[PDB]
């Protein structure tokens with residue numbers, strides 16, 4: 788197989804900036820202790836592509852998590868804060884758009900390349916958090 792546009796996401800990334808993440812977690816419903824510990828974490832994000840399968844791993848002192856998925860195909864996900872969600876990830880004009888649904892709620896996580904950074908926007912009901920990653 789040849790190259791794909793989404794190969795621009797592939798690599799090892801480290802968190803370098805976070806804005807409004809505690810408020811995003813509050814809107815999601817994350818409890819106090821988990822918010823405090825998770826808000827301290829500086830995750831590494833590891834993205835690989837193999838055929839049609841994209842894998843995203845997050846490694847931190849808080850939790851290590853991993854998802855593998857095919858674009859457009861719903862999957863089960865257990866989040867770092869221990870929500871059991873239904874997830875679908877698609878590509879929208881170069882942006883990975885990840886929708887998570889659980890208990891009648893929904894949140895959207897967008898991943899985009901900007902300059903040498905990978906920018907994550909997490910959105911829930913009017914509350915946005917921006918998490919910026921750089922290559923490790």
Ligand SMILES: O=C(O)c1ccccc1Nc1cccc(Cl)c1-c1ccccc1
Nearest residue numbers: 825828830845847849867868896907918
């Ligand atoms: O960390 C990020 O940049 C991130 C990026 C994309 C998707 C989810 C992400 N993180 C979380 C989202 C919701 C609840 C939690 Cl606890 C986390 C979390 C916090 C700290 C460490 C690990 C995971």
